[PDB]
Write a protein that binds this ligand. Structure first.
Ligand SMILES: Nc1ncnc2c1ncn2[C@@H]1O[C@H](COP(=O)(O)OP(=O)(O)NP(=O)(O)O)[C@@H](O)[C@H]1O
Ligand SMILES: Nc1ncnc2c1ncn2[C@@H]1O[C@H](COP(=O)(O)OP(=O)(O)NP(=O)(O)O)[C@@H](O)[C@H]1O
Ligand SMILES: [Mg+2]
Ligand SMILES: [Mg+2]
Lengths: 352, 361
């Protein structure tokens, strides 16, 4: 049964996930490999995520470094697994988003797929998002179709919660269409605050947020944002029209904002939820997971580890799956979730 | 007997070329459809050809407008030809080049292929240059492979004169060679557009009136791009208006029409010398692209290359205008048959590669 590579680099810019999957009747993880994002490239990618000068030249250079890194990591992984390139049918690559504007009908994932094919000797499928957007959709999330396949329990009301930058959920309710929406911010404000404040990337184990006192006025104002009816300056805006607060108290609050936006949105739509299956790097924020567990007391909260699949690799595995879907010519979007006009074949094929 | 669509919009920005071919034991042109480029889009594309602010959003918005006009074109041609999209195996889309810098190992062509597949309901092969650039090449010219399959006894020179000029050298026995000679219409277009409104000197009429200036002529040739042998893509020196005005400034003042006449000569000469250097045995010079409807330039190339016959491709049963478009339709065929697209000694890439990517309907 065919073998696929998945290449994920999310907008938290933490590193590159590479997965080896096998796609029979079952998806299965054969191996995984993590490339921590180097300091220079992270900041360079970051500086492409806002409008600025000379972007086309600059994106071309960044792209080349990103791809050389991806290709380095693919090779590393194959060698370590004792596999030839030709044992892999294709790479499913997400690329790297530097712009996502579904209101202006565009989304931009750099990733020179053609160089990746050149450097790996493997067929690449990339540029998954643009066809959904071309079809009247948001081009995101793409994971809900994959969640359904991978968890097809026509018994329990499972809910699959990805906490990266942003929290997004896939509600699997026996004998119905899957649903999907964005809860709100995941790690993105928590990273942003402890980055602004100290220079750190994230708040390991939710330790800094746990050492602080929740502010309720700030929290109430945050939760009252229109979205529910998300960058540092947005949060510096809210910090204006309140008392000055200790740094930890803002982190604590930010962590509560994440946990409550999740909680309300998920029992508001699937109130009889047996299992919340957490995946993504927010699964490792023990402190946030504690709070999710309390605000969902009569539901079992845990990572996808409990049901067989490590949470850090979920998204990596999904893009491997989308390569498979592309080549089998089977829809990769869920239009109900994306707003697309219907089922679309997602991606393009760059043959080795 | 597969049919393919070819979509071309070159650096001259005259408009979009849409061609339909049948690929069998050879390539037959079935239909042509030309779209004039809206003056809005033309200037917005030109605005993306130099470094600038907010290029990602800008180009993404320009691309939407470009794809909308391309699909409108495809839909019109199909209807007018009484065929449905199902009858077409694929569109070969060149996109629109906004930045070509092989020396920085990148080429950027826009024209959102996913949205093109969405709007036409036809599979799209796009983004042909990037694999060749990825494997060390210049990413251009890509037409030689096609020129060879069309017109491959005879030592032939197949000459495209668009914005720039490129020559395929079809030497019986030896590998297919060739390179960007340099300026075709680009400078003559730009001078008559600086001086006056219009985007090109119809028939070489303005140029013919004027008289060449040998001092200016001698200088422009004196340039670093021209002496370079083998794999080269125009832009080792960017032939553009700022390039010329500089040269104008270091000489005394001259009439406009003389400058045009000199520009005309510069294209004729760079072609001659670069072409003859590499193939003095050349017997026929087959000329395509819009430069072939320039009467002056054509008559002048004849003279500069006496030992061979200089005729446009219509006399070999292919209209000059549609040669590039047919080549991108043919590249979609090659992609779909997994047959090489580049000629590596032309491009200077490591070896043969299948070019492009598939965005399926
Ligand atoms: N031990 C940990 N403690 C706390 N937070 C952690 C820990 N490990 C990872 N994280 C968080 O998880 C984030 C990365 O999660 P990840 O799922 O890779 O996000 P992403 O790359 O943005 N993908 P996406 O969800 O597609 O946007 C990091 O930036 C941290 O905020
Ligand atoms: N009647 C004419 N007389 C003289 N020149 C003409 C005439 N018609 C077209 N041209 C020239 O031909 C050019 C267009 O040629 P074309 O082959 O379409 O260029 P292009 O494809 O945009 N460039 P490139 O990217 O190098 O292929 C125009 O810009 C004019 O300079
Ligand atoms: Mg990540
Ligand atoms: Mg043209």
């Amino acid at each position: 049964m065919p073998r696929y590579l998945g290449l994920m680099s999310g907008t938290s810019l933490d590193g590159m996930d590479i997965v080896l999957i096998e796609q029979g009747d079952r998806t299965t993880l054969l191996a995984s490999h993590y490339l921590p994002m180097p300091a220079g490239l992270r900041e360079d990618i970051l500086a492409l995520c806002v409008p600025g000068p000379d972007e086309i030249a600059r994106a071309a250079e960044v792209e080349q470094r990103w791809v050389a890194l991806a290709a380095q990591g693919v090779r590393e992984l194959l060698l370590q697994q004792q596999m030839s390139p030709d044992e892999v049918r294709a790479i499913g690559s997400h690329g790297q988003t530097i712009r996502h504007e579904p209101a202006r009908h565009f989304t931009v994932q750099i990733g020179n797929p053609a160089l990746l094919a050149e450097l790996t000797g493997i067929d690449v499928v990339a540029d998954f998002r643009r066809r959904d957007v071309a079809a009247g959709g948001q081009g995101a999330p793409l994971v809900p179709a994959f969640h359904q396949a991978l968890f097809g329990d026509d018994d329990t009301s499972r809910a699959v919660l990805n906490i990266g930058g942003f929290s997004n959920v896939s509600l699997l309710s026996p004998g119905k269409p899957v649903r999907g929406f964005d809860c709100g911010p995941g790690n993105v404000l928590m990273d942003a605050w402890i980055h602004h404040q100290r220079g750190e990337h994230f708040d390991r184990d939710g330790a800094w947020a746990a050492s602080g006192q929740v502010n309720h006025a700030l929290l109430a104002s945050l939760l009252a944002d229109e979205f529910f009816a998300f960058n540092l300056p947005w949060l510096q805006e809210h910090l204006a029209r309140h008392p000055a607060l200790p740094a930890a108290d803002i982190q604590a609050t930010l962590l509560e904002l994440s946990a409550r936006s999740i909680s309300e949105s998920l029992l508001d739509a699937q109130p009889d939820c047996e299992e919340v299956l957490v995946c993504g790097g927010g699964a490792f924020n023990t402190a946030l997971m504690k709070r999710l567990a309390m605000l969902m007391p009569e539901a079992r909260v845990a990572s996808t580890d409990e049901y067989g699949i490590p949470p850090a690799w979920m998204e990596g595995m999904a893009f491997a799956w989308l390569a498979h879907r592309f080549l089998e010519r089977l829809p990769g979007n869920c239009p109900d979730v994306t707003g697309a006009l219907g089922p679309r074949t997602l991606g393009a094929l760059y043959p080795a």
